[model samples]
Target: SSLIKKIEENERKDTLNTLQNMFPDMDPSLIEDVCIAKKSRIEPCVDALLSLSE
Candidate 1:
């Protein structure tokens, strides 16, 4: 099972909210998926999303 968290949970939400502004054209699901898959990293998500046009 994946690690669960208390304080760590908010960053994902914050990250996606920020990403949402940066990538208005992207589906939230896609952005969320990328972040999770990329180890919750924002840069990789942005990189992939940029290729898809952020």
Candidate 2:
């Protein structure tokens, strides 16, 4: 349990660090854009990242 907790904390910190690095000036408008226009692809965009073995 303690190890899992440590891993979770490290993962959260790493995610935050990466997001801050990529978007130091993150905009609220970008999120609104995604919410409003999230269907520009013919197939599901999530499939773009899948492994072929699925």
Which has the greatest lDDT? 1
Error of 1 at 20 (Å): 0.5
Report lDDT (Cα) of residue 54, candidate 2: 64
Model 1 residue runs over 4 Å out of place are: 1-6, 37-54
Minimum summed lDDT over a 10-residue window in model 2 is located at 37-46
Q: Which regions of candidate 2 are displaced past 4 Å?
A: 27-54
Residues 1-54, candidate 1, lDDT per residue (tens digit)?
A: 123343345677788899999999999999998875545454555568779994
Report the alpha-carbon TM-score of model 2 versus the true structure: 0.41
What do the candidate models score in CA lDDT, each in turn? 0.70, 0.51
Q: Model 2 over residues 1-54: C-alpha lDDT tens digits?
A: 465556555655565566566777876456335433433342333345354436
lDDT of 2 at 41: 41
TM-score of each: 0.51, 0.41
Candidate 2 residue 6 Cα shift, in angstroms, is 0.5
